[PDB]
């Protein structure tokens, strides 16, 4: 009865960049050393990340106990509107869990996420899924390449639902 989300990257953009995104664009991101996993928005653990054996997974490094234990209880670019911040989220993957199984976690635990490695990651704005993207590495600088994406119009509508 609980969802564990693993964010890969948070990319701060302006509305205009959001609406101009198209497949093939690569969005620069910081090499994610650590990965903070969240439950309805709230960090509950940090972890390293990889695969097992074909699924993405987290290797837990640190549980944030107080929080876990409390779960138990058409318009110019000059326009200011175009400069409004929209956070763009790349999820590494998710997993549904019971509070019990969650609390059973410890340093070292390997949690598999509900997605196959090599298949495109979910990309969201304002918590709504608006595109797919694939990790790309060139001379150790990381990026996410947009593989599929809804229309600029639908982006605009999902943002302000």
């Amino acid at each position: 009865e609980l969802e564990l989300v693993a964010n890969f990257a948070d990319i701060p953009l302006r509305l205009s960049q959001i609406l101009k995104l198209k497949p093939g664009d690569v969005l620069p991101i910081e090499k994610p050393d650590r990965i903070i996993a969240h439950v309805d928005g709230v960090p509950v653990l940090t972890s390293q990340y990889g695969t097992v054996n074909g699924q993405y997974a987290l290797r837990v490094e640190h549980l944030i106990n107080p929080i876990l234990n409390s779960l138990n209880e058409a318009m110019q670019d000059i326009d200011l509107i175009m400069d409004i911040p929209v956070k763009l989220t790349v999820e590494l993957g998710r997993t549904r869990m019971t509070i019990k199984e969650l609390l059973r976690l410890t340093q070292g635990s390997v949690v598999a996420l509900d997605g196959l490695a090599g298949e495109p990651l979910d990309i969201l704005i304002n918590g709504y899924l608006i595109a797919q993207g694939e990790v790309v590495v060139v001379a150790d600088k990381y990026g996410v390449r947009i593989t599929d994406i809804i229309t600029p119009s639908e982006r605009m509508r999902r943002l302000s639902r």
């Binding site: 994610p32 390293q48 990889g50 054996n53």
Partner: peptide, 6 residues
């Protein structure tokens, strides 16, 4: 078994 990425 877990192989670490990144």
């Amino acid at each position: 078994v877990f192989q670490q990425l990144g």
